[PDB]
């Protein structure tokens, strides 16, 4: 993403996806 | 046994890195082919399976990520710390733990691809210390340790 905080929040979103699928 | 979980994290992450790299070859970083049937090894392998699925589904995000990782790796700690802290500012769950593991794996792989060797141990230390100081180890301990990931 544009900034590292943006990157971290995108990873939070991906982690929630993982938590919902596995 | 928060400290126990924190120590277990090292072996979990090492096994995760090994198996994720191995299945990514079934389609390179020598440092990821060495130094591993214990409980934590098995947990790492399972998590590496789910992490490979996620890495294929979110390839572009994980590649875009590395634009902030300087090619010399002089800011490895800064990059890791800031991104993971943003990751866990909104809470902790197992999925986010797996995401942190995959983030560490890609950071370790990329610093090698940029010609910095012998850095995988340090990314492992990054992961262990972050999970300890950001209450991730306490959380995992509160859910029964790393072994509870096998469910
Ligand atoms: Cu690069």
Numbering used by the authors:
A (entry chain B): 68 to 89
B (entry chain A): 23 to 49, 56 to 64, 68 to 182
From the paper:
Here we show that autoactivation involves binding in trans of the BH3 helix α2 of active BAK to the activation groove of dormant BAK. To stabilize and crystallize autoactivated BAK, we disulfide-tethered BAK BH3GGC peptide to engineered G184C BAK (herein referred to as BAK BH3-BAK complex). We determined the crystal structure of this complex to 3.1 Å resolution, which revealed 10 unique complexes in the asymmetric unit. Cu2+ acts as crystal contact coordinating two BAK monomers. The GGC linker is largely invisible in all 10 complexes suggesting its intrinsic disorder and minimal contribution to the structure of the complex beyond tethering. However, in marked contrast to those previous BAK complexes, autoactivated BAK exhibits rearrangements of a buried electrostatic network with helix α1 at the bottom of the activation groove. Of the 10 autoactivated BAK here, seven feature 2 hydrogen bonds between α1 R42 and E46 and α2 N86; one has only 1 hydrogen bond between α1 R42 and α2 N86; and two (those with lowest b-factors) show no visible density for this network. The destabilized conformation of the electrostatic network is unique to autoactivated BAK providing the structural basis of BAK triggering by BAK BH3.
Mitochondrial poration by pore-forming BCL-2 Effectors, BAK and BAX, initiates apoptosis. Its apo structure exhibits a stable globular conformation incapable of executing poration. Autoactivation is mechanistically similar to direct activation: binding of exposed BH3 of BAK or activators to the activation groove induces conformational changes in the electrostatic network at the bottom of this groove destabilizing helix α1 to initiate BAK unfolding.
